[PDB]
Each structure stands twice: as structure tokens, then as C-alpha cells.
Amino acid sequence: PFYEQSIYDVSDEFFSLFLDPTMAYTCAYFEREDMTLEEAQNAKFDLALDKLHLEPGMTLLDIGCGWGGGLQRAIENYDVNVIGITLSRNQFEYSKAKLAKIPTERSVQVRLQGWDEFTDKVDRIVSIGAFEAFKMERYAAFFERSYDILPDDGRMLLHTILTYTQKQMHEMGVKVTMSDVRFMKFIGEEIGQLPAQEDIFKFAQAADFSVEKVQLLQQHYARTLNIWAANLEANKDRAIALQSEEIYNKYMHYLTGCEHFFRKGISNVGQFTLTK
Ligand SMILES: CCNC(=N)NC(=O)Nc1c(CC)cccc1CC
Ligand SMILES: [Cl-]
Ligand SMILES: [Mg+2]
């Protein structure tokens, strides 16, 4: 009967207190065990981009380009035109300015645009950590739009957090405690729908994609979240100064709780190679 500060309300400066310098907010890939967080984030973008079989002169679309680290690796390591789209104004301005400083002989575009608006023809698509925000009632249209803008040899790499069914968690030996259910409720009131592995298969193969590979990075995310949490704790006083002890505690709770979910087996994260 009235109108009444969440983790969403934090500034980009707040995220720089605990993300690596490239501002990746998605699962890293510790290709070597002694990699730093930044090296492992680079390795995760490189892992994704390598699966696209990019050739010189192709155009690459990044759906949900975040703070731009994925397209930075694409511009630096491939001779391709890139288009990045995002619906975040902060990330749009950040990525446009970050990417403008990179030498290139190709075209580079960053747009404030959603996927349901995107009509350009592109040769390859990467989408890292954008799918989690889609509603399942939008899944079909997403894969259809992606399929239609690709050519006949088109490839797409979809990277997304995944959940398990109750039966799967049963068979796997994953016993969900009350603190796990308390945490899933916490995610409701502070963070709506996550796909299972089989869902990506269903909706991608319904849109005439073929699934050629799924790669699961469960324990890489546990390590990613562990490092994020250690960084934020190192920067606690600054985090509380920018925000509040309330917000610092919520973010630490959220990072360490998510870490626990990946470590114990409740959550996973997959890269899906889709071909046309
Ligand atoms: C939908 C857009 N978001 C992503 N794809 N991924 C994250 O939000 N990852 C993440 C998680 C998830 C386990 C927990 C704490 C903090 C972060 C990022 C800083
Ligand atoms: Cl990212
Ligand atoms: Mg992304």
C-alpha cells in the first residue's frame, strides 16, 4: 500500500571491486590450474570463440555483450567484424568506449538493442551469460531469430547457467538442505527462470539447430565465485562506502551461496555449440 535498494542498484564501480580487470561477470575457465582470474576469463572467451570457426572477414554478433571483454578478445584475436548488443545503458557506454580503443581493420559496432529487434545478417553468434534473463516463453523466438540471421554454415555458441530437475538431483546424490531452500528463496526476492540442459537441446533442436557439443564448467564457476568473494571481502570498506554494509553482506551472501551451489552439485553452467 506504499512504494519502498537491491544488489541490482550497484554501480559499475561496485563491480570493479571484485570482478577482474576485464569486468567479466560470467564463469571463468581455468584452462591451467594456476591461471589468474583475468587469464581464466580470457580463456573462457577464447574457448567460446574458438568453437565458432571464425574466418577472416566474417561478422560476429555478441548477444548481451556485457562490459565488452568477449568482443575485445574477438577483435584482438580474429580478423572479424563484430557487432555487440546489450540492453544495459551502462554496459553499452562502457563497451562502446572500451572497444573504440582497440586497433582493428574491420567494422566494430556496439548497440543498445535487444535480440528481438536484431535483423542484421551475421556469420556467427556468441551469447555468454545473457540467456539466464530470458523467460522460457521467449526461448522459441530466441532460437528462431538466431537461426534466421545465420547463413547455411552458421554456428552459435550459447553459454548459460543450468539447473537440474529434482529427479536428477536425487539420482546424482545431491541432497538439498533447508539452507539451500532458504537460499533459493533469497534469490527470488533479490534476483526468474533457469533452463536445464535438456531444455536447451529441446528448444535449439526445435529451431532446426543441431547441438554438436555441450561443455560443463561447474567447478570453474565455483572457483570464479570464490575469487569474486575474496576480492569483495578484500574491498569491503570501499564496498560499504559506495553502498552499505547491508548491500555488502547481501552480495557476499549471494556470491558464497552460489559458490556452494556449484560446489555441491545443485547448479551447473554449460557452453552449447549449435550448428545450422
Ligand atoms: C544473467 C546475467 N548474469 C550472469 N550471466 N551471470 C551472473 O550474474 N553471475 C553471477 C552469479 C551467478 C552464479 C552470482 C553472483 C555474481 C554473478 C556476477 C557478478
Ligand atoms: Cl561477461
Ligand atoms: Mg555476454
Side-chain angles (χ1 to χ4, degrees), residues 87-95 97-100:
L87 285 185
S88 170
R89 172 155 292 289
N90 291 332
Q91 291 182 334
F92 161 77
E93 297 289 352
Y94 190 94
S95 288
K98 165 190 254 177
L99 296 185

Side-chain angles (χ1 to χ4, degrees), residues 47 80 85 147 202 223 246 274:
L47 177 67
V80 292
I85 61 177
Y147 190 92
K202 180 159 64 159
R223 189 178 174 172
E246 164 164 347
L274 312 177

Side-chain angles (χ1 to χ4, degrees), residues 23-26 44-45 66 128:
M23 291 286 288
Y25 57 88
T26 53
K44 177 271 308 298
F45 293 121
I128 294 167

Side-chain angles (χ1 to χ4, degrees), residues 122-124 147-155 208 275-276:
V122 299
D123 292 293
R124 304 287 189 270
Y147 190 92
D148 180 67
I149 64 173
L150 289 169
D152 298 340
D153 57 308
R155 303 176 64 90
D208 281 318
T275 58
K276 177 164 165 176

Side-chain angles (χ1 to χ4, degrees), residues 102-134 136 138-152:
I102 301 171
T104 182
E105 289 177 348
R106 303 283 178 181
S107 188
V108 174
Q109 305 175 70
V110 177
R111 302 175 187 175
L112 197 65
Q113 180 177 38
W115 62 262
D116 44 316
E117 317 184 87
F118 188 89
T119 65
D120 305 63
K121 293 170 162 175
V122 299
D123 292 293
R124 304 287 189 270
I125 292 156
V126 61
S127 195
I128 294 167
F131 192 92
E132 294 90 340
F134 305 165
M136 180 172 164
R138 295 209 97 190
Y139 284 12
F142 169 72
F143 290 110
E144 291 178 8
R145 177 69 37 80
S146 306
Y147 190 92
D148 180 67
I149 64 173
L150 289 169
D152 298 340

